Amino acid sequence: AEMKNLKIEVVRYNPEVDTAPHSAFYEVPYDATTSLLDALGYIKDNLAPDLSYRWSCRMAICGSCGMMVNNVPKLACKTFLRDYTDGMKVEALANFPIERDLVVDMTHFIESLEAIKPYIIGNSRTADQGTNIQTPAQMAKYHQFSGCINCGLCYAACPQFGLNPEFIGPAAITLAHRYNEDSRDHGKKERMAQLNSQNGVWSCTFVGYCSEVCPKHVDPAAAIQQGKVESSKDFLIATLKPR
Amino acid sequence: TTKRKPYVRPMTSTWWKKLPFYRFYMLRLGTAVPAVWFSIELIFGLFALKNGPEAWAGFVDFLQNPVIVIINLITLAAALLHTKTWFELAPKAANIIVKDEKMGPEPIIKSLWAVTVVATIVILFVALYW
Amino acid sequence: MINPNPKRSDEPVFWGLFGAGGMWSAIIAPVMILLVGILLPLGLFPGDALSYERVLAFAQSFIGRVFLFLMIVLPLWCGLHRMHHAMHDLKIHVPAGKWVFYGLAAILTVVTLIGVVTI
Amino acid sequence: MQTFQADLAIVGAGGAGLRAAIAAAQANPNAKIALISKVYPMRSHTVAAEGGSAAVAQDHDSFEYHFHDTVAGGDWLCEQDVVDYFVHHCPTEMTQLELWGCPWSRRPDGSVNVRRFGGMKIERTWFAADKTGFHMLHTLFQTSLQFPQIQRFDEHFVLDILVDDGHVRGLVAMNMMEGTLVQIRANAVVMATGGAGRVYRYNTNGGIVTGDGMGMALSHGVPLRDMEFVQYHPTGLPGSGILMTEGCRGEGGILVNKNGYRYLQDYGMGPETPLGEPKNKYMELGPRDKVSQAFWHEWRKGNTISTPRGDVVYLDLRHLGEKKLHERLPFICELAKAYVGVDPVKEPIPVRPTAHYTMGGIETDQNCETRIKGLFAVGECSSVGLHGANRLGSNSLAELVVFGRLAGEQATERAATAGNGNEAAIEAQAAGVEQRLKDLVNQDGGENWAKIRDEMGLAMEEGCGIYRTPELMQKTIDKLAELQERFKRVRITDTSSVFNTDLLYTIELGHGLNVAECMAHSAMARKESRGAHQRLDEGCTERDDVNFLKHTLAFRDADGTTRLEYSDVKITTLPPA
């Protein structure tokens, strides 16, 4: 047989030399199994050694893949060339600054994640006492929301984040919600200030595209609305404490 | 000094035009306009009602312009769209576990529609039949 | 880097109203638009069911006073809330946006309240 | 070079590195800890594990059973005092992970559930759905955020360590985004860089698992221990090498050839068990080595199915059904559909043996310390003497948290009692790194690094696979020597400073070649068959406790040669025979 070739448009940028990003074009051989990740590797190996990008796992579990394919945020390792025979344009992950080629500044993402204290709080139990008790029912409360691989596709997806870079964002809020709903955790109060902030849940207008593009089906949109409900309760209780 | 020059892509006011998913979001927000327009119509109808039979007749004539009719026909379509989309979204606020599994959202959606269907019948019955 | 001591937003108040408004207008707006907007003016109703007399009887009745109040007011708080964010998302800059829309809602609410206690 | 101060420096932010970082923060609340990683922590390879972590838990279990399984499964190349320490500390650490929030799967009563891996008789493997590594790592990472003692250096690629007068004094790293070098001074340094499975053409490993840490240690006269013992997982997807977990066969899956025949019964793992009832030690739940070898035999008979990506057997899961699949195997179904166009409900999954885990690694004692004072090693990058000649399924994740803790605490103590070294000698070492880097950049000769890589991978696959011969091991040894010459003639055409991966991938390959040579040389000299090391030549096809009950140590001298010394295996209560 003979492998079919595909012309791929990769949006290059080198801050030492370029004043703005600019498209380049590479013919890449492919078959039904070939991923955008495979193709990026082929390019670097044979066409442009200076093509920089993030990746590692190759199986859509680490989250370093994140990038725009035809204005849709996707993971390179779960994007396949067979599906783009009419053309394929690859850009750096949207709503993040472009540092170099397909590598973006993820700092705000990490800082948002850190801010919401994503760890068990206020549980005095020690290991000599054995584990906590937690039923399937209790785990079902937060479990889906614990599946976030921090790929940041939901940030590229959210136009509110595009319009407001201080918005702590879907994944960050989702993680706060994940611990807030963990029966083992007692630090809900330690996380609300952020969630109650205008840059917290209240920057969300429920566009819902974060859940759409989420490769691990976390449904962060649902975590935010539940967050809005929880923030509202917290507002009411706060009004009624003249203490 | 750094050798980095972070390129920040701007976001235009036409961001929503590009992707049909963003378009349906904007169209949802769009439903607000007729809704507000309808609430306004009702205030006119309310005060035309208190000013007596004369004012009420002028209100009813307005409603059969019939450019207004087409606007109201559109208003109805918007309201039904708002309903369809509202019931798709409200379920996401509930975190309900049934038999060690997070429920939803179909069981809730169906219920909301059942209430809408009954309400419409109960109200149409009460308003017209007597 | 990120604000450690952020101001609590007052959004829950408006969101709550927006929430009740959307739910009310989802269930009850279609039939009402059909009645007032279409059936009434085209005269597609039996006898004197939607005649001036019977409407006034209903309106003036206590249930009608409360019903017409919520029917008008609840959708406004939902709709004006949505317009407030349509401006933001279209990047149309509105001076004192917060106060304008929610003030308009306040105003109209009051005007409606005057209406349902008669003028 | 900008210079930073730290009590201890940790190289790598996987399971082991984080656990170490957290431990040191708790051992000394006033400590300043520098956690270094060329990726953001959560991209570390520990994230990809789906089987589980071993810890004794059921009433009818004993630490002696877990100790015995490990030692026997290690074919008696385990350091028995280390195995004993290990088993006794797993429950503490698995429970602690639970306390830090790790969502371990549960029984109805709300206690943690366990299941069977690594051929074990009594089930003890704790599991977080089929995302155990993901959950372990994210739990560990996220937990580390509350400890301000830990200053992370995210996306910093460590180049070399700083050693003087037999004592480690810091390290040199490149800020990947800036392109600038940085000195980190610390009187204790913990290597936690993962294994070296990317020296193989086909593997289950993430791109980052390049053997960097093992290479750096080689450079300073620290030997790499038992490097010949490389573990293949028997069921990986062809081409990509992506892991299809043992869980598939745990939930009753089967392995068949082109004739639909369950070949495993003919290779000593009979008799066939019925579709509903898989039994431990039999058929598709037989010994890992026997299963991986069965494929090879079937390939010889021409019973493997042929595909574009390679010769395969079929992993058939149709007879499982939805409920079982989507409760315990959902991710496998996504993997199958995406990477081989196969729906497990309606079709069989193609598979073949695939390079997986690096049993060998940096030589350490029972406290995770190397022959260089203050320099520690932990996790897959190390050889603490836990795994001997074959690692037990699900003992790797437990090692990370058990010895990660130890190393974290141990390193805290050395730092405290270190005392100052010679300032000029150290700065000279730092200059040495910066200079060696400039030499590589200014290097030229028009060789493409990628092709050397491609060929290294092919050589390891052919020479150091499931079945080994002196012909092909020599062929691989010679091939690597060739590629080492070619490496000096490589030219790195990208001279940019902003996230220049051309330079970085080339450095990785350098380490890989050094490690690959240790693997091949160790294998060639080991004239016996033991665990994952299996030979076909006359007089080498069997275990030999008379002559080869000993660890291989591979040194690399300044002249670029790979020399071997051998060391003894500590026995306590379980001698062989």
Ligand SMILES: Cc1cc2nc3c(=O)[nH]c(=O)nc-3n(C[C@H](O)[C@H](O)[C@H](O)COP(=O)(O)OP(=O)(O)OC[C@H]3O[C@@H](n4cnc5c(N)ncnc54)[C@H](O)[C@@H]3O)c2cc1C
């Ligand atoms: C697909 C798969 C499934 C598995 N499943 C299981 C299982 O179910 N149970 C089990 O017990 N074991 C399993 N294993 C084995 C086990 O998960 C790994 O051996 C273990 O997680 C490795 O952890 P680590 O901390 O030693 O290294 P890693 O997790 O690989 O982390 C290494 C760290 O070092 C950093 N690093 C490396 N080089 C440099 C450098 N030059 N500069 C800076 N940083 C550097 C990396 O960025 C990374 O953060 C599995 C392995 C694979 C591949």
Ligand code: SF4
């Ligand atoms: S939520 Fe879904 S998308 Fe947003 S980060 Fe976590 S995983 Fe990536």
Ligand code: F3S
């Ligand atoms: S995309 Fe954006 S605004 Fe809300 S629901 Fe999702 S976050």
Ligand code: FES
């Ligand atoms: S490479 Fe790990 S997510 Fe795609």
